[PDB]
């Protein structure tokens, strides 16, 4: 645990001289407040020592490590910046398919954007904090109009603020870009500084945070839709959503490469940023875009739509956020099996999905998941293995390992700090236990929808033999009944208030269901 | 009982500095800090004084031992160095049974490795930490190909680190191999320190500890199975997993003899190290050569396969780790004699059985499992008993003498530290206990699971007379019924969901079952 004031105690412990800022602790580092303590999980950093660890790493600091070194830097030098390209064909067939026709070479100098000839793909280097050497480089790649996210090292390891050295401690105001093309034409006209997410909208990691401390105005600006807004909502959470602003989606409200390439006023749209912080009582000043929105888009109004059930898609209409819903089924139907293709495929379309499977040996679970991903059948296919690993290795997906109510819940609560979980699976609810057997699962049942309601997290629990109580407390619930042929009836949507089933064909050579 | 603190107040009783290591803790020998006293039953030894015993007896020292000599160094002088033999056909006759193909002389040197012509065997010699003479000989002889394990003195007292005067004080880094002859292969590319475990992957005793203290960077590679990783995972538990590393089986990844024979580069595996210590919430990186392993050997997703019932071999599939059975039947069966003959086929196949026989007079349980070892009569073969005593005196097991619930917990818990026990065998349950019945039964086997779980020990307990409430808490059920006939009935697998039955014809002449 934490507890937030225990990490100031400690601190008063060795007697450190700290301030209070909007979320990590500064106080002066003993190994111009350079050490930076987290509120949560005290992921320490320093300025200047530039050292990095655990809070028990921490503690055991006062009493008395990573280089990433990678052949980066050969792909660099293979590659020209754009704004020192004699040709005139080439960079004309470049700002075309990159979109970057209004793009100056002004701003290409300022933000050190290079051009690699091979693939024809655009350079976003990564810089030390420290300013030393690079530490990564981003690509993207424009297919036929389609714009291909690579970089180097992997996802899980992209933590770049672009344009972070270039900010300076003079500036209060920052806006948020979810891509780094976005970001370019924003500061070429406004001026103001901007920073962009390392993997978009998909997820903030904590360690960045302490670089944002210093700025007191924050405007997001993360895209055109309903999608962005929810998860800008998300990312306010951590940094105290009251010194941070918004910028809903709308038709008069583009993403910045594309305002001012139609030629609208970009200053304009970053005037109206309406507060994300607000009492508990509101009026419709602050509501006027999201009912624009949600009359405009009606499709964004419900979740993601997926790729793999049709049948599915017509009945629950999409996967919101904070909504509970809790699946059960006669067991021997693989129901474990099911809900893995269920998260799998909203996985591949941006969902952080955390996994708690208990009793299973996740071990084997991601076989059977990793399985769902090659779309076949994986034993015969051995030698192109290593090709799926690296596709497998950049979905937002962390499992867990390992058992009481409270334990589980901290590290879920926990996993959505660290890794921005925007899902949670859980297959053995019993397990987690560790009239009372009703009583239990009455209270169990009451704390994830706790959970799922204060953190946005969408919670879909597996029941293992259906409860009166549970039906009150959750919000849709999923019944696999079986006659490998099966059927899936749904009898809550709290959203529609839909319900109805279909059969499923369930075939064991891909480890996929299916419906001709 | 220890509980860690303990020890460190009755050194606060006499004063003693001392410092906290990874599992011994450090202080200046009383009889630079040479005392060290293990976390738990804190068998205390100095690197100086070399004095060893328990912690009752570290009591009574600072109030106010052997030998092992053996005729070992006759057999020394009659075996002649393999880099000092002038011959040409012996030499290459060895290196084709032995695999030492790719050895160079200058190891051979370094570990001083001896070979013995009488039986064309090698021969690693074992010195004393003090660097005195020879303590025993380790000799390995290769049939027709299998390497056959036979030293001297007897397994159970063979606690040799090969390498140990070699690697300095100056050394941060060592692997573990599970074998001698692989463990040559790694020190000659790599360079890097390098010691083997006594009995290969079957058991490390605390009484090692101390001398692996000084390592911060431990990287285990046991074999090429899943069987290693789960053996290295274990052993990883005594020495603060946060420190260690380990090495996981693969098709690519082969034991450090052949990997050096075979061509692959070999410090490729010992940069890909992976750590066996995590948090609760884990990627898909720290498991893809798990999932890969496990695709490509289907069969050892399972435990070690009975060389005696193969009918029992195609029911319950496997004997895995950390799983728990209850077994019960009608009296007078011999079910008791039953679970003899499971436990000591798989304990002859390299698990550390411990046994916890109770009312049934262990010594004669002894009389009972011996004769299974013939397989036959013993008593008409009592002229060639002591030959079997020597072949019933390696296999890794023990006794348990003698009534509490916490009184039998905390032995087996710690005879799991001091001999490495992955198999833990009780007769009677009701001898343990000293609607009361059924709660107490209740509680008794719900203890047990959590013993069996956090331990990852498999327990295989036997039921006197059936109980609803066992079967949640338990993994695999087995009933031996009765109609010497008999046929035995599983109805819970937990692994893999198949039940059946297949009949018994016992043998009373060899105490062995057997099945036409």
């Given at each position: 645990?934490?507890?937030?004031t225990?990490?100031?105690?400690?601190l008063?412990?060795?007697?450190i001289?700290?301030?209070?800022g909007?979320?990590?602790?500064?106080?002066?580092?003993p190994?111009?407040?350079s050490?930076f303590?987290?509120?949560?999980?005290?992921?320490?950093?320093c300025?200047?020592?530039?050292?990095?660890?655990?809070?028990?790493?921490?503690?055991?600091?006062v009493?008395?490590?990573?280089?990433?070194?990678?052949e980066?830097?050969?792909i660099?030098?293979?590659a020209?910046?754009?704004?020192?390209?004699?040709?005139?064909?080439?960079?004309?067939?470049?700002?075309?398919?990159?979109?970057?026709?209004k793009?100056?070479?002004?701003?290409l100098?300022?933000?050190?954007v290079r051009?690699?000839?091979p693939?024809?793909s655009?350079?976003?280097?990564?810089?030390s904090?420290?300013?030393?050497?690079?530490?990564?480089?981003?690509?993207l790649?424009?297919?036929?109009?389609?714009?291909e996210?690579?970089?180097?090292?992997?996802?899980s390891?992209?933590?770049?603020?672009?344009?972070l050295?270039?900010?300076?401690?003079?500036?209060?105001?920052?806006?948020?870009?979810?891509?780094?093309l976005?970001?370019?034409a924003l500061?070429?006209?406004?001026?103001?500084?901007?920073?962009?997410?390392?993997?978009?909208?998909?997820?903030?990691p904590?360690?960045?945070?302490?670089y944002?401390?210093q700025?007191?105005?924050?405007?997001?600006?993360?895209?055109?839709?309903?999608r962005?807004?929810?998860?800008?909502?998300?990312?306010?959470?951590?940094?105290?959503?009251?010194?941070?602003?918004?910028?809903?989606?709308?038709?008069q409200?583009?993403?910045?490469?594309e305002?001012?390439?139609?030629?609208?006023?970009?200053?304009?749209?970053?005037r109206?940023a309406?507060?994300?912080?607000?009492k508990?009582?509101?009026?419709?000043?602050?509501?006027?875009e999201?009912?624009?929105?949600?009359?405009?888009?009606?499709?964004?109004?419900?979740?993601?739509r997926w790729?793999?059930?049709?049948d599915?898609n017509?009945?629950?209409k999409?996967?919101?956020k904070?909504?509970?819903?809790?699946f059960?089924?006669?067991t021997?139907?693989?129901?474990?099996t099911f809900?893995?293709?269920?998260?799998?495929d909203l996985?591949?379309?941006?969902?952080?999905?955390?996994w708690g499977?208990?009793?299973i040996s996740?071990?084997?679970l991601?076989r059977v998941?990793?399985?769902?991903?090659?779309?076949?059948?994986?034993?015969?296919?051995l030698?192109?293995?290593d090709?799926w690993?690296?596709?497998?290795?950049?979905?937002?997906?962390?499992?867990?390992?390992?058992?009481?109510?409270r334990t589980?819940?901290?590290?879920?609560?926990?996993?959505?700090?660290?890794?921005?979980?925007?899902?949670?699976?859980?297959d053995n609810?019993?397990?987690?236990?560790?009239?009372d057997?009703i009583?239990?699962?009455?209270?169990?049942?009451?704390v994830?929808?706790?959970?799922?309601?204060?953190?946005?997290?969408?919670?879909t629990?597996?029941?293992?033999?259906?409860?009166?109580?549970a039906?009150?407390?959750?919000d849709n619930?999923?019944?696999?009944q079986?006659?490998?042929k099966?059927?899936?009836?749904v009898?809550?949507?709290?959203?529609?208030?839909?319900?109805?089933?279909?059969?499923?064909?369930?075939?064991?050579?891909?480890?996929?269901?299916?419906?001709?």
């Open positions: 645990p934490v507890t937030a225990e990490i100031r105690q400690y008063r412990g060795h007697g001289p700290f301030q209070d909007h979320s990590c602790l500064r106080a002066l580092s190994f111009s407040f050490l303590i987290d509120k949560t999980t005290g992921h320490f950093l300025m200047t020592s530039l050292a990095e660890g655990s809070w028990e790493d921490f503690q055991a600091s009493e008395g490590e990573f280089e990433d070194s990678e980066v830097r050969r660099w030098n293979r020209i910046p754009l704004w020192e390209l004699p040709d005139q064909e080439e960079v004309q067939l470049a700002d075309t398919m990159f979109g970057l026709t793009v100056t070479d002004d701003t100098k300022r933000f050190s051009y690699l000839r693939a024809r655009l350079v976003f280097p990564w810089f904090p420290g300013g030393s050497g690079l530490r990564g480089l981003k690509l790649e424009a297919k036929c109009v389609s714009y996210e690579t970089t180097i090292p992997r996802p390891a992209y933590h770049n603020l672009f344009g050295p270039l900010i300076s401690r003079r500036d209060a105001e920052v806006v948020l870009t979810s891509r780094e976005d970001s370019l500061n070429q006209s406004t001026g103001l500084p901007t920073l962009t997410l390392p993997r978009g909208t998909t997820c903030l904590p360690a960045l945070l302490p944002l401390e700025f007191r105005r924050i405007v997001f600006w993360l895209g055109d839709d309903l962005s807004l929810e998860a800008a909502k998300l990312f306010a959470r951590k940094l105290n959503p009251k010194r941070c602003f918004l910028v809903r989606p709308g038709d409200q583009p993403r910045p490469l305002a001012l390439n139609g030629g609208f006023n970009l200053s304009r749209i970053l109206t309406l507060p994300a912080w607000h508990s009582i509101v009026s419709f000043r602050q509501l006027r999201e009912v624009l929105g949600e009359l405009s888009n009606v499709e964004q109004a419900a979740g993601l790729s793999r059930f049709p599915l017509r009945i629950l999409g996967h919101r904070g909504e509970l819903t809790v059960t089924g006669p021997g139907s693989g129901k474990t809900i893995s293709e269920y998260a799998l996985c591949s379309q941006g969902v952080n999905t955390l499977s208990f009793e996740n071990v084997r991601a998941m990793l399985t769902q991903f090659a779309e076949g059948r994986l034993e015969d296919q030698d192109k293995y090709h690993a690296d596709r497998f290795e950049d979905l937002p997906l962390y499992f867990m390992t390992f058992q009481s109510i589980v819940i901290d590290t879920m609560q926990h996993a959505v700090y660290v890794y921005d979980i925007c899902h949670v699976i859980i609810l019993q397990f987690m236990m560790g009239t057997r009583a239990a699962q009455d209270y169990i049942i009451g994830f929808r706790k959970f799922a309601t204060d953190n946005n997290c969408h919670v629990l597996v029941i293992h033999p259906g409860s009166a109580k039906s009150q407390e959750a619930v999923l019944i696999l079986d006659r490998g099966r059927y899936l009836q009898s809550k949507n709290r959203f529609d208030g839909d319900v109805g089933v279909f059969p499923l064909e369930f075939n064991k050579n891909s480890l996929t269901f299916s419906i001709p």
